[PDB]
Amino acid sequence: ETLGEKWKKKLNQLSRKEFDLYKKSGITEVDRTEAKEGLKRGETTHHAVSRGSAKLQWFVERNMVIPEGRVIDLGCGRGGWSYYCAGLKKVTEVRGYTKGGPGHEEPVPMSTYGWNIVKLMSGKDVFYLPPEKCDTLLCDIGESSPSPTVEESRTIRVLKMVEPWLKNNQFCIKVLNPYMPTVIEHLERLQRKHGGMLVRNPLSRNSTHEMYWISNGTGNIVSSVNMVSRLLLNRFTMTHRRPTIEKDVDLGAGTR
Ligand SMILES: Nc1cc(Cl)ccc1NC(=O)Nc1cccc(S(=O)(=O)Nc2ccc(C(=O)O)cc2)c1
Ligand SMILES: C[S@@+](CC[C@H](N)C(=O)[O-])C[C@H]1O[C@@H](n2cnc3c(N)ncnc32)[C@H](O)[C@@H]1O
Numbered sequence: 001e002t003l004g005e006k007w008k009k010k011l012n013q014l015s016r017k018e019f020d021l022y023k024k025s026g027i028t029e030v031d032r033t034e035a036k037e038g039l040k041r042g043e044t045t046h047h048a049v050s051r052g053s054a055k056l057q058w059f060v061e062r063n064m065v066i067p068e069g070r071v072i073d074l075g076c077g078r079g080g081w082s083y084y085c086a087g088l089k090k091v092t093e094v095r096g097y098t099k100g101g102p103g104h105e106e107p108v109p110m111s112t113y114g115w116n117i118v119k120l121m122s123g124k125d126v127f128y129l130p131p132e133k134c135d136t137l138l139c140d141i142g143e144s145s146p147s148p149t150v151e152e153s154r155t156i157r158v159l160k161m162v163e164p165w166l167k168n169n170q171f172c173i174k175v176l177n178p179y180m181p182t183v184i185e186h187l188e189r190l191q192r193k194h195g196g197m198l199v200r201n202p203l204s205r206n207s208t209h210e211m212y213w214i215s216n217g218t219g220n221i222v223s224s225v226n227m228v229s230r231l232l233l234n235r236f237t238m239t240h241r242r243p244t245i246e247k248d249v250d251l252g253a254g255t256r
Pocket of ligand 2: 049050051074076077079081082098099103104105125140141142
């Protein structure tokens with residue numbers, strides 16, 4: 001019924017070859033060549049551990065979330081968001097939590113600028129964690145699934161989990177499937193209470209309808225979601241557009 005549901009049905013009809021040509025058509029991406037080569041060699045300075053550092057940097061450099069004080073990073077994985085925040089002037093502590101174990105990335109130890117204010121803790125399912133006081137709440141959880149009802153369930157669970165962590169603080173939260181009417185209802189209620197806006201990051205793949213609820217902005221959630229569904233549906237029409245290439249983020253070295 002929603003434009004997003006039509007997008008997901010069409011995405012599920014693609015062959016692997018078609019899917020591989022669609023997923024990056026017209027997106028933006030950072031060139032990870034140098035970082036991957038450095039990481040393979042065990043280099044611990046300058047490189048971002050994942051594409052996530054540039055993905056969060058995109059929101060921060062637009063002032064959509066402005067990390068400060070004690071940052072919590074839920075679903076930190078290898079730690080791209082955490083290591084990026086560790087170098088920001090207003091940040092004083094970064095605590096990352098992630099599941100780890102089979103099927104999940106482990107935190108990567110690094111020596112990028114501000115490493116000494118970061119603690120990444122694996123073996124932590126955030127759905128069992130009691131909330132902690134923080135000045136910035138980040139969450140990048142939401143596992144894609146071919147089933148949109150599984151994605152709807154996973155999105156609602158994240159939105160219910162994150163709310164007790166929100167106390168008039170800065171935030172950036174992934175919304176895996178933002179187009180279902182039940183999710184829209186939660187998002188509108190959450191925006192009435194905590195403010196912010198839902199934003200599509202250009203570095204996201206066309207194979208996910210993810211959007212991020214960020215704290216600094218206003219706007220109409222329904223309009224923003226439908227614009228993304230129409231964008232993703234239009235990207236099935238034409239031949240692959242190679243992604244727009246950008247430089248990856250240099251996270252430096254040193255303590256603070
Ligand atoms: N065409 C289109 C298609 C889709 Cl499916 C979704 C969105 C758009 N359009 C844009 O995204 N337009 C836009 C224009 C100039 C700069 C940027 S920006 O993201 O670089 N910086 C911002 C953005 C918003 C605010 C705000 O509202 O406070 C603050 C800073 C975005
Ligand atoms: C891949 S990370 C996102 C990228 C990350 N922001 C970065 O920059 O590296 C998302 C993570 O959420 C983790 N995750 C999934 N379910 C989780 C849960 N219940 N509790 C904690 N972490 C979870 C996954 O293991 C995955 O590593």
